[PDB]
Amino acid sequence: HWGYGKHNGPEHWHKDFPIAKGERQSPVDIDTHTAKYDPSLKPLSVSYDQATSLRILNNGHAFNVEFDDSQDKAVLKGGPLDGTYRLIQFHFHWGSLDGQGSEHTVDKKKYAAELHLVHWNTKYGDFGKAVQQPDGLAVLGIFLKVGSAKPGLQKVVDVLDSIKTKGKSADFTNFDPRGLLPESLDYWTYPGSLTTPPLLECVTWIVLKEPISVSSEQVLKFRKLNFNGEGEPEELMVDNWRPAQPLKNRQIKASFK
Numbered sequence: 001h002w003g004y005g006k007h008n009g010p011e012h013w014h015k016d017f018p019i020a021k022g023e024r025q026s027p028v029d030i031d032t033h034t035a036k037y038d039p040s041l042k043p044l045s046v047s048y049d050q051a052t053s054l055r056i057l058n059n060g061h062a063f064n065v066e067f068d069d070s071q072d073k074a075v076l077k078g079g080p081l082d083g084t085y086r087l088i089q090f091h092f093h094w095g096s097l098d099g100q101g102s103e104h105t106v107d108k109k110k111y112a113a114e115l116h117l118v119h120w121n122t123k124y125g126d127f128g129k130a131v132q133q134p135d136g137l138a139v140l141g142i143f144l145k146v147g148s149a150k151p152g153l154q155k156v157v158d159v160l161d162s163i164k165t166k167g168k169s170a171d172f173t174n175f176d177p178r179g180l181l182p183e184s185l186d187y188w189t190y191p192g193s194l195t196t197p198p199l200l201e202c203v204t205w206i207v208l209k210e211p212i213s214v215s216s217e218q219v220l221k222f223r224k225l226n227f228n229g230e231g232e233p234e235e236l237m238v239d240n241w242r243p244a245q246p247l248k249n250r251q252i253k254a255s256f257k
């Protein structure tokens with residue numbers, strides 16, 4: 001029953017998920033001047049050449065593009081990470097207006113949307129086991145600003161009408177997530193959590209400094225999705241973002257000077 005409405009939104013989540021008030025919650029504001037350059041941080045290794053997308057699902061909170069993660073086909077390594085993390089899905093969070101929608105903020109700036117590429121640590125064998133571990137997941141976060149279209153996003157945009165409502169899915173094969181990346185892989189990193197219930201504190205966050213540009217028409221199509229199921233009153237899927245949470249006893253590290 002959690003969601004993003006007045007009656008079930010982020011302010012309510014702690015009542016069923018007490019970890020909502022925990023010590024390593026996400027997202028956070030990235031204060032660029034306080035983040036420390038860490039020269040020991042390695043370049044990120046994004047290896048998506050063998051990615052196998054399978055399906056796109058409206059889950060009532062966002063839409064997930066799901067991948068075959070039964071083998072090491074699309075993996076994230078390097079950066080702050082030890083070992084190999086397999087891509088399981090990506091999704092976005094976005095706003096009702098271009099001035100909001102991102103979960104992380106940068107010097108309090110909100111972007112129009114934020115892409116999360118979710119990966120799990122292969123030493124734990126599957127995703128369900130990984131979320132129970134402090135180093136179980138690595139989520140690569142990428143900001144979206146509104147400007148020029150992102151050509152690699154269009155195949156995603158164009159299928160959304162077929163998954164308008166909660167529980168709908170569609171075949172979504174041969175999608176290359178490399179088309180969603182910016183040019184630079186400079187990043188900030190910090191230990192955090194899932195940003196939706198169950199809010200588990202299992203994520204190494206890697207947030208790219210360079211946003212990608214998407215067109216107004218592209219993001220408008222995100223906003224035509226529904227939180228509700230088919231044959232239910234229409235509630236537009238917008239503002240599905242959690243606001244910044246207290247940093248507490250954490251340091252944000254930068255890969256770049």
Ligand SMILES: Cc1ncc(-c2ccc(S(N)(=O)=O)cc2)o1
Pocket residue numbers: 001002003007008009012013014015016017
């Ligand atoms: C009107 C209404 N019926 C049930 C709920 C509700 C249930 C769980 C949550 S929570 N704590 O999971 O966010 C928030 C609200 O609201």
Ligand SMILES: Cc1ncc(-c2ccc(S(N)(=O)=O)cc2)o1
Pocket residue numbers: 116118139193194195196197198
């Ligand atoms: C129970 C469950 N299965 C998958 C997830 C989940 C995955 C990523 C994120 S996020 N927004 O932190 O990338 C939030 C929740 O929740």
Ligand SMILES: [Zn+2]
Pocket residue numbers: 091092093116195
């Ligand atoms: Zn997310």
